[PDB]
């Protein structure tokens, strides 16, 4: 009977840490299922402001092409008749720069002729 | 022998019951403990395109400034010459034109003279 006393008390502990460890492992356990609960909805987070940058950055990346190839085409154009606006500036420079110099060249053709309109008269 | 055939098969039942538990458990933790690490893994990874994604930003943002006011500085320098231009160019042509009109009436005053 005293050896009987020991006997289910060495198995009354058996049990008592089989539920002390089972919790001391459950403890630990839900000290996971949460620290996992987060890195589970931190992905989800970062993982939707990356979609949020993507298509926000699709419209910029479409749109400032599109309002960047607007400016190319008035930039040659704004270069092209810029430089109509020299052909024709130039191009009148002669004719009136001639026309200044061809009653000149008109001149000695003419003032010869005042020397000897007055050898007749 | 029942009695003793008994209560050992149910003390052995629940023992095994009771190993199982812990068993099936600590199964269920490096588990939990491995995908807690295989998302670190995957957050890791995010935090580390939104840093290489953002440094790209960066340049493609600046330039693109550093474009616009080569451009800018373009534009605006030929609006100037072309100013400059019609302006100035016009200032040649009632010089010249005076000119062209002392020797239109001085061949009419040639001609009066004559």
Same mark, same amino acid.
Request: charged residues 40%.
């Given at each position: 009977?005293?050896?009987?006393?020991?006997?289910?008390?060495?198995?009354?502990?058996?049990?008592?840490?089989?539920?002390? /460890?089972? /919790?001391?492992?459950?403890?630990?356990?839900?000290?996971?299922?949460?620290?996992?609960?987060?890195?589970?909805?931190?992905?989800?987070?970062?993982?939707?402001?990356?979609?949020?940058? /993507?298509?926000?950055?699709?419209?910029? $990346?479409?749109?400032?092409?599109?309002?960047?190839?607007?400016?190319?085409?008035?930039?040659?154009?704004?270069?092209d008749?810029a430089n109509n606006?020299v052909?024709?500036?130039?191009? $009148?420079?002669?004719?009136?720069?001639?026309? /200044?110099?061809?009653?000149?060249?008109?001149?000695? $053709?003419?003032?010869?002729?005042?020397?000897?309109?007055?050898?007749?008269?």
């Amino acid at each position: 009977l005293e050896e009987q006393l020991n006997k289910s008390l060495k198995t009354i502990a058996s049990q008592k840490a089989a539920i002390e /460890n089972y /919790n001391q492992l459950k403890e630990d356990y839900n000290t996971l299922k949460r620290e996992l609960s987060d890195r589970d909805d931190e992905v989800k987070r970062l993982r939707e402001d990356i979609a949020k940058e /993507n298509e926000l950055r699709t419209k910029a $990346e479409e749109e400032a092409d599109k309002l960047n190839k607007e400016v190319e085409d008035l930039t040659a154009s704004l270069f092209d008749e810029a430089n109509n606006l020299v052909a024709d500036a130039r191009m $009148e420079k002669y004719a009136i720069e001639i026309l /200044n110099k061809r009653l000149t060249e008109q001149l000695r $053709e003419k003032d010869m002729l005042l020397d000897t309109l007055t050898l007749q008269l």
